[PDB]
Amino acid sequence: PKQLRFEGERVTWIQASTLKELLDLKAQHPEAKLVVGNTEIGIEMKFKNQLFPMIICPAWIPELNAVEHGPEGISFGAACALSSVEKTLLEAVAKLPTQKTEVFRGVLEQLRWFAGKQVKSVASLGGNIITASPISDLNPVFMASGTKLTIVSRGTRRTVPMDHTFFPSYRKTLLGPEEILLSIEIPYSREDEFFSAFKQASRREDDIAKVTCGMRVLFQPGSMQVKELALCYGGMADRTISALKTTQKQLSKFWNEKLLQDVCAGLAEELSLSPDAPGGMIEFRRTLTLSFFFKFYLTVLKKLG
Amino acid sequence: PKQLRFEGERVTWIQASTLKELLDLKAQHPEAKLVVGNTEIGIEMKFKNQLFPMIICPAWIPELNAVEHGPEGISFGAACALSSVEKTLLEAVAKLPTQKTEVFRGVLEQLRWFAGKQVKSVASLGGNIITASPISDLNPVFMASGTKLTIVSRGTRRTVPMDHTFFPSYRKTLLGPEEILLSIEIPYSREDEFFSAFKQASRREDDIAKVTCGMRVLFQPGSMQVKELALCYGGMADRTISALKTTQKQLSKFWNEKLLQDVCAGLAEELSLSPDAPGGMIEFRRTLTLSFFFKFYLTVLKKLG
Amino acid sequence: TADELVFFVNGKKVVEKNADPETTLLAYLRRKLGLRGTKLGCGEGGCGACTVMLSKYDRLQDKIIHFSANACLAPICTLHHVAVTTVEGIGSTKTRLHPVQERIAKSHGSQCGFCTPGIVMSMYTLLRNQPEPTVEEIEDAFQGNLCRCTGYRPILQGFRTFAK
Amino acid sequence: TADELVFFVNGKKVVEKNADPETTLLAYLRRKLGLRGTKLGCGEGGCGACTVMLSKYDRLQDKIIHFSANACLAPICTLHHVAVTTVEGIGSTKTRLHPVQERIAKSHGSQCGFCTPGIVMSMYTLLRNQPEPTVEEIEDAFQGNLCRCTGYRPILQGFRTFAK
Amino acid sequence: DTVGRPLPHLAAAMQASGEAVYCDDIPRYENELFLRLVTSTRAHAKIKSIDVSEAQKVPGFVCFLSADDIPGSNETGLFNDETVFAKDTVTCVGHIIGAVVADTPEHAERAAHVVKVTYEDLPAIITIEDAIKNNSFYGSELKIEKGDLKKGFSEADNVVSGELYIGGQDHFYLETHCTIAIPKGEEGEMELFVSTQNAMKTQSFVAKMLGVPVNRILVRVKRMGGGFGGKETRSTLVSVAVALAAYKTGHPVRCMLDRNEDMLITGGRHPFLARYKVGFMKTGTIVALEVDHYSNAGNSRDLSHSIMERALFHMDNCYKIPNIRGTGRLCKTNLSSNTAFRGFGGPQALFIAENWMSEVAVTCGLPAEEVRWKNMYKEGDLTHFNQRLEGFSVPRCWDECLKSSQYYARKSEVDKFNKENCWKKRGLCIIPTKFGISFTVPFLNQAGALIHVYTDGSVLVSHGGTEMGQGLHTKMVQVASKALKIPISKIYISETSTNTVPNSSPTAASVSTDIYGQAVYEACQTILKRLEPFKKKNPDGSWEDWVMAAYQDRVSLSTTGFYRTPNLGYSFETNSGNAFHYFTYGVACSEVEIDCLTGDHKNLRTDIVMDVGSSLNPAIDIGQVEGAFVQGLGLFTLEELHYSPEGSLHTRGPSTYKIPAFGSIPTEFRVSLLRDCPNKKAIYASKAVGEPPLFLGASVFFAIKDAIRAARAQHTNNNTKELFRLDSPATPEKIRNACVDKFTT
Amino acid sequence: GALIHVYTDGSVLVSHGGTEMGQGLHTKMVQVASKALKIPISKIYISETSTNTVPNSSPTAASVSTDIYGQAVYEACQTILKRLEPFKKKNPDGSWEDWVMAAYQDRVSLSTTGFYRTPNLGYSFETNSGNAFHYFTYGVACSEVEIDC
Amino acid sequence: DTVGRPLPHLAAAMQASGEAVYCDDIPRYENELFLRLVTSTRAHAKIKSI
Ligand SMILES: Cc1cc2nc3c(=O)[nH]c(=O)nc-3n(C[C@H](O)[C@H](O)[C@H](O)COP(=O)(O)OP(=O)(O)OC[C@H]3O[C@@H](n4cnc5c(N)ncnc54)[C@H](O)[C@@H]3O)c2cc1C
Numbered sequence A, B: 001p002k003q004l005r006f007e008g009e010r011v012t013w014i015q016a017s018t019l020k021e022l023l024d025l026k027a028q029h030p031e032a033k034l035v036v037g038n039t040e041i042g043i044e045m046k047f048k049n050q051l052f053p054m055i056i057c058p059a060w061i062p063e064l065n066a067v068e069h070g071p072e073g074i075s076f077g078a079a080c081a082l083s084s085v086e087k088t089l090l091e092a093v094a095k096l097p098t099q100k101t102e103v104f105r106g107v108l109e110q111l112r113w114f115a116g117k118q119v120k121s122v123a124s125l126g127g128n129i130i131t132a133s134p135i136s137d138l139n140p141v142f143m144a145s146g147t148k149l150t151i152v153s154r155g156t157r158r159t160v161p162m163d164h165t166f167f168p169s170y171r172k173t174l175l176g177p178e179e180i181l182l183s184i185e186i187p188y189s190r191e192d193e194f195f196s197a198f199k200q201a202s203r204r205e206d207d208i209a210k211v212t213c214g215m216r217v218l219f220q221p222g223s224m225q226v227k228e229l230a231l232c233y234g235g236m237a238d239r240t241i242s243a244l245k246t247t248q249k250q251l252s253k254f255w256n257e258k259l260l261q262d263v264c265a266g267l268a269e270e271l272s273l274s275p276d277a278p279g280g281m282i283e284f285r286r287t288l289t290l291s292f293f294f295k296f297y298l299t300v301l302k303k304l305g
Numbered sequence C, D: 001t002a003d004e005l006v007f008f009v010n011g012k013k014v015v016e017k018n019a020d021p022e023t024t025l026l027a028y029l030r031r032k033l034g035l036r037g038t039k040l041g042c043g044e045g046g047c048g049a050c051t052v053m054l055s056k057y058d059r060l061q062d063k064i065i066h067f068s069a070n071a072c073l074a075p076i077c078t079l080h081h082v083a084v085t086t087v088e089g090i091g092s093t094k095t096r097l098h099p100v101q102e103r104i105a106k107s108h109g110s111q112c113g114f115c116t117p118g119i120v121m122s123m124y125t126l127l128r129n130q131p132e133p134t135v136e137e138i139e140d141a142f143q144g145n146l147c148r149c150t151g152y153r154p155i156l157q158g159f160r161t162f163a164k
Numbered sequence E: 001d002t003v004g005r006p007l008p009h010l011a012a013a014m015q016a017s018g019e020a021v022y023c024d025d026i027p028r029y030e031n032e033l034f035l036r037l038v039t040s041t042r043a044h045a046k047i048k049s050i051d052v053s054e055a056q057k058v059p060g061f062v063c064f065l066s067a068d069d070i071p072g073s074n075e076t077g078l079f080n081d082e083t084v085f086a087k088d089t090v091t092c093v094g095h096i097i098g099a100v101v102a103d104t105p106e107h108a109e110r111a112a113h114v115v116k117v118t119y120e121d122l123p124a125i126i127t128i129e130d131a132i133k134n135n136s137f138y139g140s141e142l143k144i145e146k147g148d149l150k151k152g153f154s155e156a157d158n159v160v161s162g163e164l165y166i167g168g169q170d171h172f173y174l175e176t177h178c179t180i181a182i183p184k185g186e187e188g189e190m191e192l193f194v195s196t197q198n199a200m201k202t203q204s205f206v207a208k209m210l211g212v213p214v215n216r217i218l219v220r221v222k223r224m225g226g227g228f229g230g231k232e233t234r235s236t237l238v239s240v241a242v243a244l245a246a247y248k249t250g251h252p253v254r255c256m257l258d259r260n261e262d263m264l265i266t267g268g269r270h271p272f273l274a275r276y277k278v279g280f281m282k283t284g285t286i287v288a289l290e291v292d293h294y295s296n297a298g299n300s301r302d303l304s305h306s307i308m309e310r311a312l313f314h315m316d317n318c319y320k321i322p323n324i325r326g327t328g329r330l331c332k333t334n335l336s337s338n339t340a341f342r343g344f345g346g347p348q349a350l351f352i353a354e355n356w357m358s359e360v361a362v363t364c365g366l367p368a369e370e371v372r373w374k375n376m377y378k379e380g381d382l383t384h385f386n387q388r389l390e391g392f393s394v395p396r397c398w399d400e401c402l403k404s405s406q407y408y409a410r411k412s413e414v415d416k417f418n419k420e421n422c423w424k425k426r427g428l429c430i431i432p433t434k435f436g437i438s439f440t441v442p443f444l445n446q447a448g449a450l451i452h453v454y455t456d457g458s459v460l461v462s463h464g465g466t467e468m469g470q471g472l473h474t475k476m477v478q479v480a481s482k483a484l485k486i487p488i489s490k491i492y493i494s495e496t497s498t499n500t501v502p503n504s505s506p507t508a509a510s511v512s513t514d515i516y517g518q519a520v521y522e523a524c525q526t527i528l529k530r531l532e533p534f535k536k537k538n539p540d541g542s543w544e545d546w547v548m549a550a551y552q553d554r555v556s557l558s559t560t561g562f563y564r565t566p567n568l569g570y571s572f573e574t575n576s577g578n579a580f581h582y583f584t585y586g587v588a589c590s591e592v593e594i595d596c597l598t599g600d601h602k603n604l605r606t607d608i609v610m611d612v613g614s615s616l617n618p619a620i621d622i623g624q625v626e627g628a629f630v631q632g633l634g635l636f637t638l639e640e641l642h643y644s645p646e647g648s649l650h651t652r653g654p655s656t657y658k659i660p661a662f663g664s665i666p667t668e669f670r671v672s673l674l675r676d677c678p679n680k681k682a683i684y685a686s687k688a689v690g691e692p693p694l695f696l697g698a699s700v701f702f703a704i705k706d707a708i709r710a711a712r713a714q715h716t717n718n719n720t721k722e723l724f725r726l727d728s729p730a731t732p733e734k735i736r737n738a739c740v741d742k743f744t745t
Numbered sequence F: 001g002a003l004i005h006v007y008t009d010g011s012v013l014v015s016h017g018g019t020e021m022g023q024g025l026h027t028k029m030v031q032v033a034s035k036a037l038k039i040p041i042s043k044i045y046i047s048e049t050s051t052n053t054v055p056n057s058s059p060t061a062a063s064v065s066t067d068i069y070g071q072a073v074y075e076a077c078q079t080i081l082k083r084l085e086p087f088k089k090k091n092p093d094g095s096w097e098d099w100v101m102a103a104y105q106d107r108v109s110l111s112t113t114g115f116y117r118t119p120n121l122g123y124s125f126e127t128n129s130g131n132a133f134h135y136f137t138y139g140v141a142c143s144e145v146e147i148d149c
Numbered sequence G: 001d002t003v004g005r006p007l008p009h010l011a012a013a014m015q016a017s018g019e020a021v022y023c024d025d026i027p028r029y030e031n032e033l034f035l036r037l038v039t040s041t042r043a044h045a046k047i048k049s050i
């Protein structure tokens, strides 16, 4: 395979055959748009009337399609189709002990009533992440689990866990102008670690006001005493957000009725929407942030007591 | 104006701006086809399935369009439209003494129920001559009058009166591979010089068996004693022919009933057709060679007695 | 590495960048320019259905010259810097008919109509050269145009009105 | 100085020498290749009317892989060395209908018929991957296809006959 | 003879192979151009300027079209209150200002986006509540009133009042609006290929815009990829635009709307606001009813008045109410003009009836089935509009549905589930429908046909009806085959066209099978009479031979057929005369399961029993019942249109507007056609089936409402006889909010 | 055969089996329908000949087209006139347009076939009897020529 | 009433302007192809090969 060049009335397309080409091209043209499945770029160009005079397609590059099993979890090249991620995670879930697949099963739950086969067969993992939609069903799960992102440019390579700081403002991520997301490692579940993922079954605006979440609790060995707690939400702001103020207060508390009530009060306050917040459904959305946590609360108890 | 070059699937066309270009091109590519009006070539290419991979169009060249009045007659560039030839000759005829326009009026007679204005506006003079159709209405008149032809290639220039030798075989003329017809001088009529032109009002085959003629007599000063006699016929052979054997016998004879009979007998014999000559109409064509001469014979008497 | 052919059709510039020497003006008008008023009747110069007017500045004569031609036989490659006028170039029922078009129509000079543009263009050409023709000029203008429907009488009767 | 795009549609080679990056596969099928079985329903990946199958040799996996895609969102410039199969690729009333096409037709799974090629292509793709699917695989194959006429029951009853 | 047989849609095999041609599948002419509409982005504003400089720079740009290029008339619409192109002011977000013409659809799209318009905003009215407050209505109040309302209310034990809202609906035909216009270049002649249910009005509106007689315009319709009412009048928005570009350029022009344009521009189902008051007895028996309806009509009249008439005709549903007053107003608003949608105001008014009927039963502490059955009309009863109900078959459908659904046994198991579950509840509801059959404007109830027999014995049928998936042409071929007594393989329907059948009513009102059936039947009787002499001369010969003998004896093998629906003419003064030729009846039972923590729900089971007379085609009719019902479940539970406070639609594609999916339908889904109930009033004893079953999708709404009731008993109140307001669509937002608990508080 | 439609604007569309080849059949048919209907020729149009409007037509031939299609068109016009008569009586001083619209609104069909069959034809080559033609057209010409012998 | 009157052919004005459409004047579809007959050059003969 060799690099291909296509030229239109308005757009120049380069099909990169190799990671090195991709990173060289990206450093020569930092404003160039990566396109993989085009399930978002195609919408942006058609409906939001964006024009990207220069596009690079990295879909051929072997590194961006690699599926790897490591000690920490399963890594997926950023160009892996959602169907491939789903197939891999289904196979992992069937093979591994339940205790190690809490996050995998959370990923799969968000993928359940996602798009049809036609979209999942071409929509990429990295594309969903870097799209950075406020209502992405995947970024809450990745944020809650601390999914590790490998991010590369010419010279530079760095791995970071996904956290609140990765999505600084609307539709924006923590990548430089010349950077591309290489791979994503979805972690194994530890002992005393539990996870859930929930979603509003219906959006009403294109990219706001659909509640979706990823929830993780890690307990002290053999106990019900909180060691770590992460509650991450889409649909509640112009970005994926973490309820950090609420969960920080629950560190070294016990999983009881008192925790339930303290989290709900923290959530109701930390994630409160103004009456004219974009997207409306103000009461419903509030109720969902609390009801979803209740769902997580009861599921965790069943996984314990 | 500059030379233009057009390239198609099968044909390369060169529009020459200049005599020099024409002659250089013609020497470099002796097989190249000159096209002016295309009223013959277009028929040849469409209906007789000729292909000429290389065409030169000399219509722009000023020499090939030049109308000149000399002491001997009126010269026309080979590219002059028949309509221009006709307009010039009508103007000459209205202005000059009848005695000087016997040939001009014979040219005009052949042009009378020729094609329509659309054809005469683009069909060239040199084109009709070099076509060399056995039934050309013009070549008999030119042959009978001894119309002078200027013929040029690179280096070479030569003027010849048109005679029997100019059309050696079917569709062929006495030009070299590299030669073009430059101009044509239609002569003034002399004292004691008389001319007629006649034609069959109807062809039945595309290029044979339509009788057409040009007839010239030159008498000794003030007499009825034949000095020169030229009887030229189309439609009687695969080429324009002259009844030389018949007319040579009449030299220094008198324009009487005895000459009438002698010429008719010469004609009937010299121009005899075999029963299955191409184009048929054997009796009719015979009858017309004689009836046309009779018409000339009587008209000459009226111009005299 | 080929030259551009530039001509005009009905007052409008045609730049052809890949002219084929074998392309007749008829083919070009109908099938390139989509001007279907000019008709194929024989393709051999005898019927005149394809008659159009041509116009050029004559580098010899001075003058702009106007003359009729058979589009079926005119190679486009002869027309560089030539102005073409077809039947749609002179008038229409959408806008206004030329007097020639109106008079052939009202005089019953058109039956099937297929010869009409050709005959219209021959008459038009005559008028553009000679605005006040004789009756004799008028009948001799059409030796190139055939009509199978009318028997010709109405057409000359109608155009006769342009004379004297 | 542009590269040629080479792909296949219904077993037939397409060489595009001037590919425009903005050209969707839908536009290409319909308006370039004249294959109008594949339909526009939304142009945003929601309805599946434009579903086609795609096939490639996977340079990682080994294998030829088959998968459905939305033609409305697939840039042609992603399809270099990819084989496209549309509804006309699998069967016709002129030749022979594929069992998928026959069964949706006879089971009353087609009313206006506008969604039918897309639904046919989703089922087809499922069967090309799994010749003996479960009933569960069959209902879940269509999350990407919308039908406004049928209320879906007849389609699933028809295709249910492929299971077990 | 295939009448009563489950014969598949004639085109179904070709639709499955992608060989069936829809408007945009027709091949382009070499010189064919593409049009894109330029549309308002303000709800109410003055147009201050239109700038096309940047559009003129798009490659392939041909021209921009506006009100000033129109040769005839800019005045359009059903009541002449629309423009083809807005000139001074725009009056909704979808409002058509102009159109770009280009050489490809991609260039037309690029050029249209870059057309810049300048506005000065004006006071806008968007909601029904805005329109009531501003007295912004078309026309005056419509009203049907029977009995004595003071007095009925005096006699009543209990009186419940309330307000109810039902949102609109996007048609979501898979094939969007599409027109090809071919100008001939002679005498203003134009030929149009259109995805429309109304070839006649297309023809008229195009002729009107062009200032040209109707005889110059030929409109042709082969098939639509769905219509559902959406193409009955609104198609002309595209058609006239495209006729204009054709006239102006002299080239063929086409346009097919992208989903997002179609949704914004072409209008949908009328949102209804109802204020109601019912008087009843402790037993459940209704004694008085008062309903004021308000429809959100949008920015023109269109079919809004007729829709409101059909709503007043259906405010009874299947219940005898001795004292009744129904009124309706049409709200003039700065939204895209709303139009026909399967049901034509019926579902709205039937939803309002079943709502107060649900509240009657909760107030009386009675079982819902009991209260409905006891209030039900009997055979021979008059309606509030004084039309006798002959062959009222709801009781048969009811008892048959109870039996087949095993209602009473599943009522127990629903209560068992609810006793045993805390955060999930089940609901169960049985619901009747009746739907009146005819256009309510009597003059639309006319139908023509044209039949030709060719000398090979093959038959070509043409009628005024259009195919949009409902299998009209299939049913017409079945009718002609039975009438002519020849195999269906001898008869062909090609297309609908204004040069074969003139002046045709829109394909609408569920009456097409009825009226064109009859017109075709009549044409076939004419043929049969003409062929009868030859049939006698040669009694053992073939159809082919009789036809050839008829040709050779110079007997015409071509005839028109015409039908006019008898005995129709209702008067809103007098309250008398028949509004409908007959009623189609049905009953559905549905069970759902709600997730009280999410508002999410499962459709567990639905049983339908429909009275469709003697079905001409069981397979087609069952498919209409199922398709309609699923469109109703969409209406009542899933589909929600959403606007900005400035009146701009947000929901403009399948990602933001959810029509029912494969996985939306009831897990167990049973439809039965009622046996031995022939209809005297229609062709071969059949009944209209297109629109009547859609409202039966409300059984899902009221099953959901029952489940919410159980969640409310679990976590909110101890008051059984509690009423709470649940608007349509009952989406997860509305369901969840109604399940008041420790979380909602 | 013939088929005529009156649209609701009062505009008329005529279709018959005859084809136009320059002889002015459509012109003559429009003249006949204008006369029979009693409306100006500007209200009537003939578009084309087509097998889906008029089936089984004989070739446009034998000089009989004006004769036979003239009759069929005439007959279709009589049917339109009968159907419009009640509305003409209800509004004797109204216009064609109003009578047509009133007809449409009362659900009267404004579409009809027309058919004509030449009577009394059937010649036998055995018996040498029965009419071969409906009638004969007659004429006389005098010509003078000059020949060139 | 024009019967008996010298009314010009209805299409005569459009024939004179070249606006009247004859068969080859109809526009070509983008995918429209062209046919040419292959014809005998012999009056009576057996076809031996094409
Ligand atoms: C019908 C439909 C339904 C959908 N439903 C859901 C849903 O329910 N929940 C949900 O969360 N999402 C949903 N999506 C969104 C979808 O999953 C994403 O659009 C998709 O994964 C993006 O991937 P892509 O390969 O098509 O990216 P593209 O459109 O090609 O690109 C997306 C963005 O990512 C950038 N990009 C891609 N790869 C890299 C790289 N590795 N490094 C840096 N930048 C990169 C591109 O520049 C671009 O800005 C839906 C989409 C469709 C069409």
Ligand SMILES: Cc1cc2nc3c(=O)[nH]c(=O)nc-3n(C[C@H](O)[C@H](O)[C@H](O)COP(=O)(O)OP(=O)(O)OC[C@H]3O[C@@H](n4cnc5c(N)ncnc54)[C@H](O)[C@@H]3O)c2cc1C
Pocket: B033, B034, B035, B036, B037, B038, B039, B040, B041, B042, B078, B079, B113, B114, B115, B119, B122, B123, B124, B125, B126, B127, B128, B129, B130, B131, B135, B136, B137, B138, B179, B180, B181, B182, C044, C045, C046
């Ligand atoms: C329908 C119609 C009617 C006609 N009727 C008659 C008629 O009644 N009587 C009659 O005699 N003819 C008649 N002709 C023939 C007509 O006169 C010739 O076709 C015309 O004169 C040829 O000129 P052209 O410019 O069109 O030649 P082209 O077609 O351009 O060329 C003619 C031939 O001459 C050659 N040629 C042209 N110029 C030169 C040159 N300067 N030097 C060397 N070779 C040259 C070309 O190479 C070609 O071989 C008729 C033609 C048509 C179309």
Ligand SMILES: Nc1nc2c(c(=O)[nH]1)N[C@H]1C(S)=C(S)[C@@H](COP(=O)(O)O)O[C@H]1N2
Pocket: D111, D112, D149, E226, E227, E228, E229, E341, E342, E343, E468, E469, E470, E471, E472, E507, E508, E509, E510, E511, E512, E513, E624, E627, E689, E690, E691
């Ligand atoms: N497939 C299909 N079924 C359909 C529709 C449609 O567009 N497609 N429209 C419905 C509506 S709105 C009506 S009024 C009826 C009308 O056609 P009919 O009179 O032949 O039932 O079809 C109904 N069923």
Ligand code: FES
Pocket: C039, C040, C041, C042, C043, C044, C045, C046, C047, C048, C049, C050, C051, C070, C071, C072, C073
């Ligand atoms: S077509 Fe007959 S002269 Fe050109």
Ligand code: FES
Pocket: C109, C110, C111, C112, C113, C114, C115, C116, C146, C147, C148, C149, C150, F022
């Ligand atoms: S009118 Fe018919 S050929 Fe002239």
Ligand code: FES
Pocket: D039, D040, D041, D042, D043, D044, D045, D046, D047, D048, D049, D050, D051, D070, D071, D072, D073
């Ligand atoms: S057109 Fe609807 S998904 Fe492609």
Ligand code: FES
Pocket: D109, D110, D111, D112, D113, D114, D115, D116, D146, D147, D148, D149, D150, E174, E225, E226, E469
């Ligand atoms: S059959 Fe009409 S959309 Fe499915």
